[PDB]
Amino acid sequence: DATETADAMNREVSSLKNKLRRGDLPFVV
Amino acid sequence: ASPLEKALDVMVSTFHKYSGKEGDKFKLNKSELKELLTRELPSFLGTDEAAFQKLMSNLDSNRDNEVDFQEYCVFLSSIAMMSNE
Amino acid sequence: MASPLEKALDVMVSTFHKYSGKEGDKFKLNKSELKELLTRELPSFLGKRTDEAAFQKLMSNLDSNRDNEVDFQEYCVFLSSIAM
Ligand SMILES: [Ca+2]
Ligand SMILES: [Ca+2]
Ligand SMILES: [Ca+2]
Ligand SMILES: [Ca+2]
């Protein structure tokens, strides 16, 4: 969970989510 | 549903079972996190208050002193990543 | 005994390997393996249009280390992003 890696993973997930529905690109629903 | 779809559903339902007890119904406090880990992730538990407090801090990337669904998914990912290694 | 959540994590892992081990690097998904995993295991999350162009774009967005593969960490970022 090492803080550096949780924080990086959360940024990565937030980035991908934002692309999904704020929100470009749509192979995924 | 596929096994993976069923798995994601369990991840979601398990979070909401514990997050919805106190306070923000969509976030885990230290009490709720403790219950979830104790009852649902026993094979990964070493335990004391200090340990749960440290885990909470580590997971709390948005620095709001709770664990939200995203932070929880990142935590599960880290456990799975450990298991995959 | 393993909890439902512990078993769900096991399925996260096993489903990855089910596809990553088909071709090439046994521990990473190439574009074909990723398309198969999504098509076969995540139908409820698929859009109206599962054309090649949409998929190529998805691949690039998941491949954060730019090695033309989706590794286990990258796959977990994906699952975390779609879960709820
Ligand atoms: Ca709560
Ligand atoms: Ca938080
Ligand atoms: Ca492969
Ligand atoms: Ca990659």
Side-chain angles (χ1 to χ4, degrees):
Chain A
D1 265 337
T3 64
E4 281 87 352
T5 121
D7 293 351
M9 292 195 58
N10 275 292
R11 286 191 295 268
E12 288 168 348
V13 169
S14 289
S15 179
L16 183 60
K17 283 177 170 180
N18 174 266
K19 289 177 180 161
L20 271 280
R21 209 252 181 205
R22 264 144 65 191
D24 305 302
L25 80 253
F27 192 87
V28 175
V29 161
Chain B
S2 77
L4 185 58
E5 287 172 322
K6 287 184 188 179
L8 294 173
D9 285 345
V10 169
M11 292 165 53
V12 174
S13 64
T14 303
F15 179 83
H16 293 293
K17 173 170 151 140
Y18 295 92
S19 69
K21 289 169 171 173
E22 293 158 43
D24 191 314
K25 303 302 185 282
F26 301 136
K27 298 183 192 177
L28 298 167
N29 63 31
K30 38 172 206 62
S31 178
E32 297 168 329
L33 179 66
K34 176 178 178 175
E35 288 191 18
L36 189 156
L37 259 67
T38 301
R39 301 175 196 179
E40 314 298 354
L41 295 169
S43 70
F44 300 112
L45 287 187
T47 205
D48 67 22
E49 280 305 283
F52 302 131
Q53 182 167 327
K54 174 51 154 122
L55 184 60
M56 182 123 182
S57 174
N58 273 20
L59 293 177
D60 177 32
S61 296
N62 84 330
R63 329 299 291 113
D64 71 1
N65 197 42
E66 306 242 345
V67 177
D68 60 35
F69 179 67
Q70 183 172 307
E71 290 166 342
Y72 155 90
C73 286
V74 165
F75 172 58
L76 290 187
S77 294
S78 80
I79 294 180
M81 286 160 58
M82 130 196 344
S83 303
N84 186 51
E85 275 283 12
Chain C
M1 185 179 288
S3 73
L5 186 60
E6 289 169 333
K7 289 181 223 152
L9 297 182
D10 286 345
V11 168
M12 286 178 63
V13 176
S14 66
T15 303
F16 177 84
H17 286 272
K18 179 176 177 181
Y19 298 92
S20 68
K22 294 188 174 212
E23 307 170 5
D25 196 315
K26 298 298 190 174
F27 302 97
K28 308 185 184 177
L29 302 160
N30 64 32
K31 199 235 76 191
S32 177
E33 294 168 333
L34 176 68
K35 183 175 172 160
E36 193 178 330
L37 187 158
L38 303 176
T39 297
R40 297 197 200 158
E41 310 292 345
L42 295 169
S44 65
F45 295 92
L46 294 167
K48 193 185 88 186
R49 299 171 60 178
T50 50
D51 51 87
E52 188 63 28
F55 190 68
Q56 288 286 3
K57 190 170 190 189
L58 179 60
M59 177 76 176
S60 284
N61 286 299
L62 295 191
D63 181 21
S64 51
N65 78 338
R66 215 168 165 208
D67 64 2
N68 193 47
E69 300 287 88
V70 175
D71 62 31
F72 187 73
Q73 170 265 106
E74 288 167 336
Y75 159 86
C76 288
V77 169
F78 174 65
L79 295 181
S80 298
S81 299
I82 67 166
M84 184 180 65

